[model samples]
Target: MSKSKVDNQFYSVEVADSTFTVLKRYQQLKPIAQGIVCAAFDTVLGINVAVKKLSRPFQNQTHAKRAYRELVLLKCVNHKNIISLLNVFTPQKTLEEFQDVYLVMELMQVIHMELDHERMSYLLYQMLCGIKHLHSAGIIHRDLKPSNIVVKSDCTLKILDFGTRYYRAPEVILGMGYAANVDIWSVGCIMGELVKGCVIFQGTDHIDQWNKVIEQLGTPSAEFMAALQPTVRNYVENRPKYPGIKFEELFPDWIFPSESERDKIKTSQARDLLSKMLVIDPDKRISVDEALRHPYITVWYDPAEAEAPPPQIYDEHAIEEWKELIYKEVMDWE
Candidate 1:
């Protein structure tokens, strides 16, 4: 009925008669989980949740506030394919310590595995559904990377981390503004990563990011370039521009093997859908509704067959073995 320490910052705590995970804010603590919790809470709560007990307050409250607002907007817009928010709560202790803010929310956990074409196709269908919902609601989830997607045991997919700047337009790409089409672009990026099992545009900065995208999708048209904001235009102008990279060529080694193999659907039909979503021109990108209607979703996903798989129970010994294997693999990669 109260709080009990489970780990350094993590706690098993009771709230509203239910036990839940509670995490504390500390200088040494990584905020990735906290940020996730905060975003999730804001979406579910439909209000601004405070961040308290920080060793220091956020220097830019405006940015934090905007992020929170976006999360709220994202949550209010409902999408079946998107992760459903159950509830949000702020701990009494955290509120008192920070004087107003602490929040947590429940999230559906995803299981990772090597997926077959059928499984991947189902996942993409759900993703498109979520994206469609957001677009219909006039919201764009700028960040659509693999880490943000959760594939549950039943093979159902949920798009998480919605309402972040990762879905912003090119002008807003650097955090200047926001747009609904950003989600389409992100979905493309995510699709690319899904096929490759890694990021397609692994750029360290804005220029690098653009370059990498161009490397894969090719360059935008002159009219498309002309429509961009001054900042975006200047950035693109300063960089070397080519006709752009061909989408097929971007993943040549992976997606397209040879001319004979071009027609074969190596990946899921989702890849073709992704190509449309990742269009160089944001204005011309596939709309969520259109994506939802794509043949990939209409012909592939069967509701009755889309049930979650049986839960995999992991004992201590099994967990230890998994960890050892992971450690060895990481060391080998290094």
Candidate 2:
């Protein structure tokens, strides 16, 4: 079934089939709850799927169109660590007032309630593998957060929610008057949250967000600073200056646990890997492929445990088949 509606210009709808198990969707009436709810949904798939609805026609429909295109793109990609796009539906005329689209996705289950040091490291490793696949496909999940990642019933990881603005790449940012390293920047944000069990940059606006990032990661190098778009550079210059702040000082009490229940977790090495991924300088940020091969993650992750086959060179025939399947699913409004 599918339904659509528009309230206060926000367009959204719910879609699913009788066979699909409906999961609880996270609701965020309070600001802090927003992140928590979003994170919680990653674990519970019984919540209903709600696609954000946009009000009015876009001046440049590129963003909206891209959102739709992303759904299609996601359905085409296949990776063990990545979330699967199961199906999509459109709202019927009866429900057209609220939502215009539907996206069916594989349900995720929570295996562990609290993420210990080892679990955190394993999750990060899985995230890197998923991110690498997206990058290889010329895509970037601009928003890499715990909420966007889910643990399937089998204890495997799946990255979800790829149809948002934060997924824009550096080139896309420049061409569209945005920054390219936006996704990696988000990766840093996610990593910080995992380590601390809270958001590192809990900023309400752009400036606040920038300040939060600088406070933790320090100022970017001159070459790195110069690489940013002029607007980004100007914004950076205008922000309140923070100098000599280190990660350890900023997060003194936030130590990664090395031992838990007789299980040895490599807290130090995990911190180092996450630190590299969270660098302030986008240009200097580590690519997902490089991240996957990093010693910290590779050392702990057993190759045999990974269920999805390792990514192979792109095959034209496979891609075409994927495209057809996605188009049919996404375009079929109730």
The TM-score between candidate 1 and the true structure equals: 0.56
TM-score per prediction, in order, is 0.56, 0.58
> Candidate 1, which ten residues in sequence have the lowest lDDT sum?
307-316
Q: What is residue 210's positional error in candidate 2, in angstroms?
A: 1.3
lDDT of 1 by residue, 300-334 (tens): 54443232221221112343343333233223212
The models' CA-based lDDT, in order, is 0.51, 0.50
Off by over 4 Å in 1: 1-75, 78-80, 87-105, 109-113, 164-171, 174-178, 252-269, 300-334
> What lDDT tens digits, residue by residue, belong to model 2 across residues 20-83?
2122243221111010111113223444333322221112244344444555476556677776
Question: lDDT value for candidate 1?
Answer: 0.51
Looking at model 2, residue 263 earns an lDDT score of 36
